[PDB]
Enzyme design. Structure first.
Site, mmCIF file in Angstrom:
data_model
loop_
_atom_site.group_PDB
_atom_site.id
_atom_site.type_symbol
_atom_site.label_atom_id
_atom_site.label_comp_id
_atom_site.label_asym_id
_atom_site.label_seq_id
_atom_site.Cartn_x
_atom_site.Cartn_y
_atom_site.Cartn_z
ATOM 1 N N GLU A 35 5.521 -32.467 -12.578
ATOM 2 C CA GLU A 35 4.312 -31.773 -12.093
ATOM 3 C C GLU A 35 4.532 -30.267 -12.089
ATOM 4 O O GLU A 35 3.614 -29.524 -12.467
ATOM 5 C CB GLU A 35 3.991 -32.257 -10.676
ATOM 6 N N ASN A 46 -7.812 -27.230 -13.598
ATOM 7 C CA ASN A 46 -8.360 -28.439 -14.260
ATOM 8 C C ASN A 46 -9.673 -28.071 -14.942
ATOM 9 O O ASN A 46 -10.305 -27.109 -14.551
ATOM 10 C CB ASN A 46 -8.492 -29.556 -13.239
ATOM 11 N N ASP A 48 -12.485 -29.319 -14.766
ATOM 12 C CA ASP A 48 -13.629 -29.524 -13.844
ATOM 13 C C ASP A 48 -13.734 -28.366 -12.845
ATOM 14 O O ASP A 48 -14.703 -28.394 -12.050
ATOM 15 C CB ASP A 48 -13.541 -30.890 -13.156
ATOM 16 N N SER A 50 -11.459 -27.594 -10.517
ATOM 17 C CA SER A 50 -10.474 -27.781 -9.426
ATOM 18 C C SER A 50 -9.147 -27.152 -9.876
ATOM 19 O O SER A 50 -8.986 -26.859 -11.053
ATOM 20 C CB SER A 50 -10.314 -29.208 -9.034
ATOM 21 N N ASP A 52 -4.716 -27.444 -9.165
ATOM 22 C CA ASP A 52 -3.553 -28.212 -8.653
ATOM 23 C C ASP A 52 -2.533 -27.192 -8.133
ATOM 24 O O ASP A 52 -2.273 -26.148 -8.794
ATOM 25 C CB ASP A 52 -2.933 -29.058 -9.752
ATOM 26 N N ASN A 59 -4.387 -31.513 -5.709
ATOM 27 C CA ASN A 59 -5.672 -31.069 -6.301
ATOM 28 C C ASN A 59 -6.673 -30.657 -5.220
ATOM 29 O O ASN A 59 -6.824 -31.386 -4.207
ATOM 30 C CB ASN A 59 -6.200 -32.182 -7.187
ATOM 31 N N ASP A 101 -3.452 -43.565 0.024
ATOM 32 C CA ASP A 101 -4.932 -43.559 -0.198
ATOM 33 C C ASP A 101 -5.371 -44.838 -0.915
ATOM 34 O O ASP A 101 -6.569 -45.144 -0.842
ATOM 35 C CB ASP A 101 -5.370 -42.323 -0.992
#
Ligand SMILES: [Cl-]
Ligand SMILES: [Cl-]
Ligand SMILES: [Cl-]
Ligand SMILES: [Cl-]
Ligand SMILES: [Cl-]
Ligand SMILES: [Cl-]
Ligand SMILES: [Cl-]
Ligand code: NA
EC number: 3.2.1.17
Length: 129
Positions: A35, A46, A48, A50, A52, A59, A101
């Site tokens: 990562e 990202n 979209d 967003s 990280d 995110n 989650d």
């Protein structure tokens, strides 16, 4: 901060990630390697919009507030900048919520694609833990 491999393994163990939700420490070290390359200040935008953040590339879409991700949540109740600290406490606490989650470490696409099913113990081999 750029951690060494065994340095990060030790920090993750000190903050209770080792075997958290049944994921051995080598899974967490492998995820951090792919990562962020062990760099707490890593950021990646990202498509979209967003972003990280940090050693585990958490995110802004769900987990932290950066003020520039429309329609997002802040489920870790932290500014995304807290995830870039030399102290990994905020990243670890938020990663414990993410891995709880429902999809476990699959939430980390780099873990699924590069670590899952591999000899992840290699990542802590030789480390004084
Ligand atoms: Cl390494
Ligand atoms: Cl391991
Ligand atoms: Cl936002
Ligand atoms: Cl929220
Ligand atoms: Cl905030
Ligand atoms: Cl730390
Ligand atoms: Cl699981
Ligand atoms: Na957010």
């Amino acid at each position: 901060k750029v951690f060494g491999r065994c340095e990060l393994a030790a920090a993750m163990k000190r903050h209770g990630l080792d075997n958290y939700r049944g994921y051995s420490l080598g899974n967490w070290v492998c995820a951090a390697k792919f990562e962020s390359n062990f760099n707490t200040q890593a950021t990646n935008r990202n498509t979209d919009g967003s972003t990280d953040y940090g050693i585990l590339q958490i995110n802004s879409r769900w987990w932290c507030n950066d003020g520039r991700t429309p329609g997002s949540r802040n489920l870790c109740n932290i500014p995304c900048s807290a995830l870039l600290s030399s102290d990994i406490t905020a990243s670890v606490n938020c990663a414990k919520k993410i891995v709880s989650d429902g999809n476990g470490m699959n939430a980390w696409v780099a873990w699924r694609n590069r670590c899952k099913g591999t000899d992840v113990q290699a990542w802590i081999r030789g480390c004084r833990l």
